[PDB]
Amino acid sequence: ARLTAYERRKFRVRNRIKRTGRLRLSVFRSLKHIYAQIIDDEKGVTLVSASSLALKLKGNKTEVARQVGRALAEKALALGIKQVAFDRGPYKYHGRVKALAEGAREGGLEF
């Protein structure tokens, strides 16, 4: 079987987002951690970064996530960035990914 469900829905939601042409707030989440990276395409370039790794926090993976959101807003808003679009990648908007996003307002927003 070529090109899996994962990589289809992967592409699916990126492509839609990538059309509107905002800065992209992308979210990787491993079974252990959750990272988020705000990208400008056409320069192919990352601007602001935030991880549960580099922030070294733990316990209740969701609550850990809300934090790395506030962590991103705060760092991000500091460069002028306010409007972006939530990548949500191949993840249902729910739980850990929801939580980072609702922790990413108070700071740049519309999620």
Task: Tell me how far, at minimum, the Cβ of 111 lies from RNA, in Å.
Answer: 12
Residues 40-69 that bind RNA (CB under 7 A): 41, 44-46, 49, 51, 53-54, 59-63
Question: DSSP of 35-75, one letter per residue?
Answer: EEEEEETTTTEEEEEEEHHHHT--SSHHHHHHHHHHHHHHH
Gaps in the chain with C–N over 2.5 Å, residue before each: none
The C-alpha atoms of residue 67 and residue 23 are separated, in whole angstroms, by 21
Q: Which amino acid, 102? A: E
Q: Which of residues 96 and 103 has its CB atom nearest to RNA in the complex?
A: 96
The C-alpha atoms of residue 29 and residue 63 are separated, in whole angstroms, by 14
Q: Which of residues 37 and 77 has its CB atom nearest to RNA in the complex?
A: 37
Q: Is 75 in the site for RNA (CB under 7 A)?
A: no
Q: Which of residues 78 and 93 has its CB atom nearest to RNA in the complex?
A: 93
Q: Which residues bind RNA (CB under 7 A)?
A: 1-3, 5-6, 8-9, 11-16, 26, 28, 30-33, 35, 37, 39, 41, 44-46, 49, 51, 53-54, 59-63, 89-97
